[PDB]
Amino acid sequence: LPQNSAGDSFDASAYDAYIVQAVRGTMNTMSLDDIIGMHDVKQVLHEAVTLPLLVPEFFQGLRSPWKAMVLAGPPGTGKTLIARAIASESSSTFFTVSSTDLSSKWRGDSEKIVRLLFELARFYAPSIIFIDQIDTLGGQRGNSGEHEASRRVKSEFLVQMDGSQNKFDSRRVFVLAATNIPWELDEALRRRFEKRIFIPLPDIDARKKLIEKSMEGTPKSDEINYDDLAARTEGFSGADVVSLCRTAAINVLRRYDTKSLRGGELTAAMESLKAELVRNIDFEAALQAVSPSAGPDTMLKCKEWCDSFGAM
Amino acid sequence: LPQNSAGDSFDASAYDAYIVQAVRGTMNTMSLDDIIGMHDVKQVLHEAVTLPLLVPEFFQGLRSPWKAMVLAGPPGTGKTLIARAIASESSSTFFTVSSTDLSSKWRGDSEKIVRLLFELARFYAPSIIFIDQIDTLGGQRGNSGEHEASRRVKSEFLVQMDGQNKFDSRRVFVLAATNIPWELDEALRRRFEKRIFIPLPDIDARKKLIEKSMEGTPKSDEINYDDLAARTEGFSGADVVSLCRTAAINVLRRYDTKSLRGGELTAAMESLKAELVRNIDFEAALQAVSPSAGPDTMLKCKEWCDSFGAM
Amino acid sequence: LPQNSAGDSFDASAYDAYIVQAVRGTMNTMSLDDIIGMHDVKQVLHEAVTLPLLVPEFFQGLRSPWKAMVLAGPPGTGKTLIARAIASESSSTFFTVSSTDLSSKWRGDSEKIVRLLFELARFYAPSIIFIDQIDTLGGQRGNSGEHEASRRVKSEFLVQMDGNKFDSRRVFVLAATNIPWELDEALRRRFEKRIFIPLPDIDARKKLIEKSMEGTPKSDEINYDDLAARTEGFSGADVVSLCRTAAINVLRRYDTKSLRGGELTAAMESLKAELVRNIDFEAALQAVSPSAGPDTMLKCKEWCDSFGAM
Amino acid sequence: LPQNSAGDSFDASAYDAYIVQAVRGTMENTMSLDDIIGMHDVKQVLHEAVTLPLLVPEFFQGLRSPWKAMVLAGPPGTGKTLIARAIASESSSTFFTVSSTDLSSKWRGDSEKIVRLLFELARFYAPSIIFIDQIDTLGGQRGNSGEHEASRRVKSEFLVQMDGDSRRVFVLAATNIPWELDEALRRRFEKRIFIPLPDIDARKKLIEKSMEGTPKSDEINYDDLAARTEGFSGADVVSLCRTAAINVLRRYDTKSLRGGELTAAMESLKAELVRNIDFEAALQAVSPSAGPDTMLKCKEWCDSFGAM
Amino acid sequence: LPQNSAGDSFDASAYDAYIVQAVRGTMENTMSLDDIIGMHDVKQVLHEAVTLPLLVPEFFQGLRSPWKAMVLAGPPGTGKTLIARAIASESSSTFFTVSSTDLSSKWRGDSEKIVRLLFELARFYAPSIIFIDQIDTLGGQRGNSGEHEASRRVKSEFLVQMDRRVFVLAATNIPWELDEALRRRFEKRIFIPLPDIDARKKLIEKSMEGTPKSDEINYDDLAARTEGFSGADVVSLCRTAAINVLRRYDTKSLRGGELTAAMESLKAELVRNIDFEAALQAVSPSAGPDTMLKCKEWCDSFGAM
Amino acid sequence: LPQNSAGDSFDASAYDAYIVQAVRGTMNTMSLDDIIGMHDVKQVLHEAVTLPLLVPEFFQGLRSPWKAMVLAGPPGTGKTLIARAIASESSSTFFTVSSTDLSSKWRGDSEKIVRLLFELARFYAPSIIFIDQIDTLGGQRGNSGEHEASRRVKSEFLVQMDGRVFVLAATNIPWELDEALRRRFEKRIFIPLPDIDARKKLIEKSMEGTPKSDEINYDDLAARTEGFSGADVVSLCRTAAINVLRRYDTKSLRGGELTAAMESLKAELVRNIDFEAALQAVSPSAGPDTMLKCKEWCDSFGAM
Amino acid sequence: EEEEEEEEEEEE
Numbered sequence A: 001l002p003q004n005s006a007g008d009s010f011d012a013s014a015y016d017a018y019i020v021q022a023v024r025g026t027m028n029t030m031s032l033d034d035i036i037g038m039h040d041v042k043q044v045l046h047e048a049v050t051l052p053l054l055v056p057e058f059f060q061g062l063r064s065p066w067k068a069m070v071l072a073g074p075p076g077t078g079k080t081l082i083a084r085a086i087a088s089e090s091s092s093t094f095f096t097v098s099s100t101d102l103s104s105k106w107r108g109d110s111e112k113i114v115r116l117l118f119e120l121a122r123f124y125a126p127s128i129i130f131i132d133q134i135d136t137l138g139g140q141r142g143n144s145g146e147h148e149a150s151r152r153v154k155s156e157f158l159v160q161m162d163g164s165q166n167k168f169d170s171r172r173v174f175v176l177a178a179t180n181i182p183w184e185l186d187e188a189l190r191r192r193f194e195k196r197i198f199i200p201l202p203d204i205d206a207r208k209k210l211i212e213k214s215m216e217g218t219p220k221s222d223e224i225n226y227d228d229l230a231a232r233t234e235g236f237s238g239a240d241v242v243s244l245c246r247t248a249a250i251n252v253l254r255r256y257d258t259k260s261l262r263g264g265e266l267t268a269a270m271e272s273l274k275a276e277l278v279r280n281i282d283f284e285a286a287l288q289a290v291s292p293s294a295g296p297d298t299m300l301k302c303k304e305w306c307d308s309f310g311a312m
Numbered sequence B: 001l002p003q004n005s006a007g008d009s010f011d012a013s014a015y016d017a018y019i020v021q022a023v024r025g026t027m028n029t030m031s032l033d034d035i036i037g038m039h040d041v042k043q044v045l046h047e048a049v050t051l052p053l054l055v056p057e058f059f060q061g062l063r064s065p066w067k068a069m070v071l072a073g074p075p076g077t078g079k080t081l082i083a084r085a086i087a088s089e090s091s092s093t094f095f096t097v098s099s100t101d102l103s104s105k106w107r108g109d110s111e112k113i114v115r116l117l118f119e120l121a122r123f124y125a126p127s128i129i130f131i132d133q134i135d136t137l138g139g140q141r142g143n144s145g146e147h148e149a150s151r152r153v154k155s156e157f158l159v160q161m162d163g164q165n166k167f168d169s170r171r172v173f174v175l176a177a178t179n180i181p182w183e184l185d186e187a188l189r190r191r192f193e194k195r196i197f198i199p200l201p202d203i204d205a206r207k208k209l210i211e212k213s214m215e216g217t218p219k220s221d222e223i224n225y226d227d228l229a230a231r232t233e234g235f236s237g238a239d240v241v242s243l244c245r246t247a248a249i250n251v252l253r254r255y256d257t258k259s260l261r262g263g264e265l266t267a268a269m270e271s272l273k274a275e276l277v278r279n280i281d282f283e284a285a286l287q288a289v290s291p292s293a294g295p296d297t298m299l300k301c302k303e304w305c306d307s308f309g310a311m
Numbered sequence C: 001l002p003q004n005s006a007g008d009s010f011d012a013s014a015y016d017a018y019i020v021q022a023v024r025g026t027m028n029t030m031s032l033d034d035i036i037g038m039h040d041v042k043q044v045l046h047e048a049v050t051l052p053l054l055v056p057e058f059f060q061g062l063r064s065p066w067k068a069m070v071l072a073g074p075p076g077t078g079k080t081l082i083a084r085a086i087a088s089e090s091s092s093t094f095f096t097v098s099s100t101d102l103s104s105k106w107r108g109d110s111e112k113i114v115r116l117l118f119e120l121a122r123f124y125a126p127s128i129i130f131i132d133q134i135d136t137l138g139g140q141r142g143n144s145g146e147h148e149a150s151r152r153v154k155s156e157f158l159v160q161m162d163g164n165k166f167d168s169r170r171v172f173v174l175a176a177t178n179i180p181w182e183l184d185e186a187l188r189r190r191f192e193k194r195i196f197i198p199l200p201d202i203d204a205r206k207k208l209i210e211k212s213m214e215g216t217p218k219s220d221e222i223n224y225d226d227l228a229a230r231t232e233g234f235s236g237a238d239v240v241s242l243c244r245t246a247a248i249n250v251l252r253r254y255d256t257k258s259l260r261g262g263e264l265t266a267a268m269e270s271l272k273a274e275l276v277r278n279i280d281f282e283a284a285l286q287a288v289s290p291s292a293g294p295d296t297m298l299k300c301k302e303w304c305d306s307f308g309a310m
Numbered sequence D: 001l002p003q004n005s006a007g008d009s010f011d012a013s014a015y016d017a018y019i020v021q022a023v024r025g026t027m028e029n030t031m032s033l034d035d036i037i038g039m040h041d042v043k044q045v046l047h048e049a050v051t052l053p054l055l056v057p058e059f060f061q062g063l064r065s066p067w068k069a070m071v072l073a074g075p076p077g078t079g080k081t082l083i084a085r086a087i088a089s090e091s092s093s094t095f096f097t098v099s100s101t102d103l104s105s106k107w108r109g110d111s112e113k114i115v116r117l118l119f120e121l122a123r124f125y126a127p128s129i130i131f132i133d134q135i136d137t138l139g140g141q142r143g144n145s146g147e148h149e150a151s152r153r154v155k156s157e158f159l160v161q162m163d164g165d166s167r168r169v170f171v172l173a174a175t176n177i178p179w180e181l182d183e184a185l186r187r188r189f190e191k192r193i194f195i196p197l198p199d200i201d202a203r204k205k206l207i208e209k210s211m212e213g214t215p216k217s218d219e220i221n222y223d224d225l226a227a228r229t230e231g232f233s234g235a236d237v238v239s240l241c242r243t244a245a246i247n248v249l250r251r252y253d254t255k256s257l258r259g260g261e262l263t264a265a266m267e268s269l270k271a272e273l274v275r276n277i278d279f280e281a282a283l284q285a286v287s288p289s290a291g292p293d294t295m296l297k298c299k300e301w302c303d304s305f306g307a308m
Numbered sequence E: 001l002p003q004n005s006a007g008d009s010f011d012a013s014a015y016d017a018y019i020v021q022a023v024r025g026t027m028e029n030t031m032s033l034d035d036i037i038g039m040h041d042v043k044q045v046l047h048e049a050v051t052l053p054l055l056v057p058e059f060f061q062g063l064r065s066p067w068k069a070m071v072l073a074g075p076p077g078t079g080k081t082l083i084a085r086a087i088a089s090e091s092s093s094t095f096f097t098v099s100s101t102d103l104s105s106k107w108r109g110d111s112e113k114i115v116r117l118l119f120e121l122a123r124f125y126a127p128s129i130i131f132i133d134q135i136d137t138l139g140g141q142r143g144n145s146g147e148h149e150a151s152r153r154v155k156s157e158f159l160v161q162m163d164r165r166v167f168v169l170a171a172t173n174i175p176w177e178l179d180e181a182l183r184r185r186f187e188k189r190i191f192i193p194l195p196d197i198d199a200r201k202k203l204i205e206k207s208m209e210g211t212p213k214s215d216e217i218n219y220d221d222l223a224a225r226t227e228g229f230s231g232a233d234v235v236s237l238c239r240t241a242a243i244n245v246l247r248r249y250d251t252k253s254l255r256g257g258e259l260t261a262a263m264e265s266l267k268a269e270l271v272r273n274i275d276f277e278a279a280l281q282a283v284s285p286s287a288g289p290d291t292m293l294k295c296k297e298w299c300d301s302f303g304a305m
Numbered sequence F: 001l002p003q004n005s006a007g008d009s010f011d012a013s014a015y016d017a018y019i020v021q022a023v024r025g026t027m028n029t030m031s032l033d034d035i036i037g038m039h040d041v042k043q044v045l046h047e048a049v050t051l052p053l054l055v056p057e058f059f060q061g062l063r064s065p066w067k068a069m070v071l072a073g074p075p076g077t078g079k080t081l082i083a084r085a086i087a088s089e090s091s092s093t094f095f096t097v098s099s100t101d102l103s104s105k106w107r108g109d110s111e112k113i114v115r116l117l118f119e120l121a122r123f124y125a126p127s128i129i130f131i132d133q134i135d136t137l138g139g140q141r142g143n144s145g146e147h148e149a150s151r152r153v154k155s156e157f158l159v160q161m162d163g164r165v166f167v168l169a170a171t172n173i174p175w176e177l178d179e180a181l182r183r184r185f186e187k188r189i190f191i192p193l194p195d196i197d198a199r200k201k202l203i204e205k206s207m208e209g210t211p212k213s214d215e216i217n218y219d220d221l222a223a224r225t226e227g228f229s230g231a232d233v234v235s236l237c238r239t240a241a242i243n244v245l246r247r248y249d250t251k252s253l254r255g256g257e258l259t260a261a262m263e264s265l266k267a268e269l270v271r272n273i274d275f276e277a278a279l280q281a282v283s284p285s286a287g288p289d290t291m292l293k294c295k296e297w298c299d300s301f302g303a304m
Numbered sequence G: 001e002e003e004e005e006e007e008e009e010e011e012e
């Protein structure tokens, strides 16, 4: 294992080798202005990571920095992008853990993996841990027919997430998790997550800025009204608009006949095809040919959940 | 784990000795214009894996290649053939996954296999992964009797499939094949851009199938293809070929070739190589095997692709 | 290993290295007057740990001191705080063992670490063992998906915790859970105190707010009686979250997302003295909801009102 | 290792030096069998199983050979660990103790030789008594799912060792779930008894036996405390007695006086009687460790298979 | 280590000392072959299997080769170690008693040496019988749930090792857990029934030969009131009847005083008929009708009776 | 190795010379027409071995020649009999693979046997190759309390499946076969047990040297044993020969003139009631229920 | 010399 700041070291003797390897295997040029919308989550990340890095003498006592956040939303919007954005625009080390890192064949190895992960993230830096797809780890705790090992993992998260019984040693940790199904988390894990936030499907102006964002670098015409393109995609997610943009970018290639031109007269026409601009007809043909990943029941259930038990 | 292009080698020090054998066990020719009809899948495959091979300089930035496709439809309609065709037509490595290979005994000995497979497919040449019958692997997550060994495969697919995106090592294209497309997730179908439904029947293409299959050197008087193509009602893409095999065995079964051993074997065999087939054994084959296909599956798939299909 | 009182020493020769290391790994100055309410468990701790040091000639025969106590209630009411307070106020040695320090991949360690734990806790001092979240450790024995190598741990607790008329050394066993009806029917008999902990009512949350807000400058616009009257059904942790989010809302009154570096370190000193007015609570009361609706609380109340030993 | 009777000595050479330390670690006159109340049948078989073959050993011969096994079964709070200590007090036999935890080892093939060494030493010393606690572990039918391989050979070594010599051992065990026992193991246990929860008459003798030594008022009506319990576990009666005896400290407000004027105030308290107010306040506070279905299921099991 | 008949000597200089100590430790009360009630067929096959070649060794030359392996399957308490101990008494063959704790083998590749040295030592003493009790242990599947990569080697060495004559006996309570290559290799698989209403009368009238019975001669009635007793329990019934003769006179109150002639007044007392009525209300059979029918179905699907 | 047709010889000098000596011992006058049933398997063997090698273009494309076959049935059917019958009937180099030609002392020589076999199979002739008891060598592949050496032998066997040459296999428990094997096994036909005629010949041959009464009739015995496999008639005659002993009383009498009664027993002869009592008690080794699970498998996964 | 340890794995 590498050393940390101020030349210290970790004495990892009491664990076996492959546990250390399996946690060691879970360790730029983006920006936090590349996230359209989401003001409050940017506010919490502003006042929980970037502000204690500058002025730590303000955040002590009752104004302790937060130690929890869970993002609950429908599965289209950007919940992974915000985590990678905060991973790039920081100076703190990042730990991504998915549901297949906490897995082994022997008995009682998941627990020691979680223990080693939390101690290492405490040792290295004021770090940040991203446990994506949290619902595959913490379900309920007394449901019908869960194995006798996942319940120990839930117990380990519960006993480790609060702690640091010494009032000193303000070595900060900030745990971040994203899920689709927030009505299936155990209650003793749910109150450990302060700042449970809802994320919506984007509004009109968010979609307008999305199409403004996605179409840069590629030349477009000057007859494109973005307003009708906003007003017709009522119900699209934040992930289908980029797919619509990609289909409207490749429809100009499907408009000409390159499937017929085989081998010959292929490399000679591709050099002048790159300058052909993108007109309104490609957007109309892509818009007729792309339908959203619909089913608005799930957005309804998730928003009613986070309006009942949520804390912004 | 032999090798790859440019003489490099893999370092699989992280896994056991039985897991890597299960993925190594998952790795003839065919022609592209054998597959008749279905121009849309040809379009998507041509703008997906064909044109990025010769011209990598056009596909950069916004013009990134695709990474997913789903073929919905009735069973036995030519999906494995398109898989083999796009395998052999290019210089790509070809993996194949069913539901019967992602199963082992120990808990957590299935999830390393999927991550190992995806690490190999990024490690090798630009490749094609054919995951067949995902209606059993991916159900719904919030089911009633969903095991605690089935959710983690879905979670591993969702985390691995969309992976940290700047100019990757090689493109990898995953296919799909499913008879029941309404029973799929809401987070897995989003990773599958370009979902498309393909139908079974035709009249003129079934005629072209007969003209591409009935390669019998006899039967110069069995040219009844209008009625033979009008009698293909509800017959899937395998049904006409099985009918042709039935007719070609009923050539030597309509004539008494039973118990011709010792007496009159070679002359009865050599006067039969030019023996004229007619509508007799064809009529025997017509009323022998009825199609076991129901229209409810086709109607519900055509209803499902109407709402949530991005052609 | 450490020494003990009177300079003796344990003889761990029949055990391997990592066993005594893993029990070695489980071995400020807050007072007990920070806990709001909860008189009954304070009474039992007073007459069970505090008093047998002062007058030891009293607790002699039928008045033998207690041996076990399970706290049960809805999550987030103050269970681990009483344990840490008793650890910091007494003079005993303190073991915090939880259900991850009892497992190893070898055969025969899940039952030995428990025995070495109890033998060291008897060897040292009038000690206190604090097993946290025992619902994972002790389930029902005759159950469906029970692995074999947990029955050894259940039998080891079930034998060890009641063992002549000699050996006047004391060990007190404290345990907390929030699903008590999944305890085995033979392990609930060992725990002879099964108190229930309630949610705070309308006379306790006022005192909890008044304890939590001292140390930060405030105004006198605040009506604590209304703030207790609207915050109904909350946890303790939600009350502390409310009292924190009010101050962070006071940070949000100065829009600091625009400024970056230029006199920013000198900007917050104008904010570091600002008062906390009533609009801050009037925003935080709709900013925060409770943690979980009442369905576990009624199950624990119907459980401890039939099988509970107050 | 000590020497047995008649100055003999054992040859423990084939066994490793930590097995012998374990069995040596497995190995007075405090209480008596008149302390424990009720339970006439197990007292009878204990009287005709260890006491009487010490007086007239020329009578228990042939068909009249003494017993070789017994297993108690009942609810988990009625007293079946106590009788083992009582018979450990009132005999002159080398009493062993073996639970389910000092049989395991992380080497292959040490968990079956411990049992062989245990039975060999139990033969070698004396007319001994071994007491196997919580036999539901190491029990259970062998055609179960998830049964590890060494945990089959333990039951095999037991089943070959518990038969087949005027040197007596009398194995006894105790459990809470007798139906999860192996089938070919509960034949070797020659006497399977049932232990009921105490009726309305034994509870009065429990209350009277408990309150001795502590000065009480002579006006405590024991019959009402007997008839009001009605379903108590038998061990809960002692807890009710302890709560009613310690309740006098929760009457005098001893929360404020600390150190000074308190160490004499408890001496003023130390000779205070336990009046009926303590019992009437104690009955509103203590409830049984209930769920009487387990008693009913063990009663039906030992009424369909039990050898009283 | 002793010699054998005709002064031959085994050259056991090729192994360690604790191995030969173990296999010699696995090597007299004369019981009777007619001291067991029932089961005439197994007595016939034992008579043909071990006694008849001693008398007439010319008959067993070609196609009449004597049997070489055998297994009894049935419920616990039908006396499967009783036939083994009886035939160990009343024969001239050198008996052996192997077990699963006799194959502990803390090292690696040492159980294999033990089994091979056992079978080579068995071919030294010429008439030999090997008695493997409870072959369920070491007799699981070769790809089962709980297995190391070492016990499979034990099973394979046992299968090849079985090829100067010996004869192996064995028994189980659970027959269906056995293998296939191990099952086909054993030539004779025999079910053992529980005693019927006619054998029980002989069993209870035969066991009661020391104590004086007077008039409880309703042995048909005593065999008719016990429906499904499992053989090893009626002896417990007679034993409980004797102790019920003891329990009638209250002797728990006497403490030393005159307690020697009080037993002399009870050492001459006879077993009356009141003892059996209190004896039937205090003994129930150890099993229900569950394992017996399963053993019957397994012996009907594979038993060459 | 000897030569093949048209005068060539294999050069396996890169591999060892005792591996080829271990496979060279695998390449008769069996009953060619003397099988009085199962004419369908003879028809498919006549039309898949001989007829596409007499008229090679009569079976091509749509009239497809097969490439594999997994015979399922009892261990008493004549898979070896018809296999050697096609060996002595066709002009093919009949190889054999048992359960013992997959064991070698080194590591890495347990996989080259399959490769060298497939090379010889493509080199020699219009061959037909057979592997016996594939369900015993290859069950489920990737287990962990099965060590990796048999996993690698099965992996090299599936790696050498892509071998003209016709591969063939025979099994006894067919649902134990793997999922990747049956997709290459185009036909798994159900093979019923043999007839009245087959047992009487082994009855008449297996009872040599034994004094028999001349009142016994082989027809009545041969017609009442419908359902017996090959070793069961040997078991039946063994129980008859021991019933000869079981008629007398020898356990009760002893010592006095026992050898006279034993000499009378050795002088004695078998009756017909001896065969009656032997047949009225002796059961088959497997009950008629594994056939039902075999027919469930050929109905579910098999092409039958 | 060579010795042997024991493991414990779980499965579903």
Ligand SMILES: Nc1ncnc2c1ncn2[C@@H]1O[C@H](COP(=O)(O)OP(=O)(O)OP(=O)(O)O)[C@@H](O)[C@H]1O
Residues within 6 Å of the ligand: A034, A035, A036, A037, A038, A074, A075, A076, A077, A078, A079, A080, A081, A082, A178, A180, A238, A239, A240, A242, B187
């Ligand atoms: N607010 C946003 N601003 C900019 N881009 C966005 C926004 N929301 C979504 N996107 C775009 O949508 C695409 C998909 O987003 P993403 O992959 O983060 O979904 P996700 O959070 O992974 O969903 P899930 O976590 O449910 O799988 C991303 O490429 C991202 O660029």
Ligand SMILES: Nc1ncnc2c1ncn2[C@@H]1O[C@H](COP(=O)(O)OP(=O)(O)OP(=O)(O)O)[C@@H](O)[C@H]1O
Residues within 6 Å of the ligand: B034, B035, B036, B074, B075, B076, B077, B078, B079, B080, B081, B082, B177, B209, B237, B238, B239, B241
């Ligand atoms: N368009 C076609 N041209 C030629 N042959 C076809 C065509 N469609 C189907 N077939 C025949 O049908 C058979 C079945 O096709 P395929 O192997 O793809 O089944 P499938 O679609 O994978 O079945 P399923 O989807 O149920 O797994 C093929 O072997 C092929 O011979």
Ligand SMILES: Nc1ncnc2c1ncn2[C@@H]1O[C@H](COP(=O)(O)OP(=O)(O)OP(=O)(O)O)[C@@H](O)[C@H]1O
Residues within 6 Å of the ligand: A162, A188, C034, C035, C036, C037, C074, C075, C076, C077, C078, C079, C080, C081, C082, C178, C208, C235, C236, C237, C240
């Ligand atoms: N009654 C109370 N008095 C003082 N502080 C309290 C009270 N209730 C809650 N708190 C505060 O709430 C926080 C949570 O307390 P604690 O950690 O004990 O919850 P918990 O009981 O451990 O939760 P769980 O039962 O789910 O484990 C503590 O920091 C504590 O300061």
Ligand SMILES: Nc1ncnc2c1ncn2[C@@H]1O[C@H](COP(=O)(O)OP(=O)(O)OP(=O)(O)O)[C@@H](O)[C@H]1O
Residues within 6 Å of the ligand: C186, D035, D036, D037, D075, D076, D077, D078, D079, D080, D081, D082, D083, D174, D176, D234, D235, D236, D238
């Ligand atoms: N009926 C009783 N007679 C005498 N003592 C009793 C009785 N019931 C409870 N006790 C008390 O219970 C304590 C031990 O509990 P007990 O003897 O009931 O073990 P147990 O509960 O039977 O064991 P297990 O938990 O395995 O059932 C002793 O200190 C004893 O004083």
Ligand SMILES: Nc1ncnc2c1ncn2[C@@H]1O[C@H](COP(=O)(O)OP(=O)(O)OP(=O)(O)O)[C@@H](O)[C@H]1O
Residues within 6 Å of the ligand: D184, E035, E036, E037, E038, E075, E076, E077, E078, E079, E080, E081, E082, E083, E171, E172, E173, E203, E231, E232, E233, E235
């Ligand atoms: N058929 C019988 N005749 C007389 N006594 C019997 C009979 N069967 C059992 N017994 C009595 O029961 C006891 C049981 O002996 P044995 O161990 O041989 O039975 P078992 O069925 O082999 O036991 P297990 O198979 O459960 O080990 C014997 O000591 C014998 O006294």
Ligand SMILES: [Mg+2]
Residues within 6 Å of the ligand: A079, A080
């Ligand atoms: Mg995501």
Ligand SMILES: [Mg+2]
Residues within 6 Å of the ligand: C079, C080
């Ligand atoms: Mg807590």
Ligand SMILES: [Mg+2]
Residues within 6 Å of the ligand: D080, D081
């Ligand atoms: Mg007890």
Ligand SMILES: [Mg+2]
Residues within 6 Å of the ligand: E077, E079, E080, E081
């Ligand atoms: Mg026995």
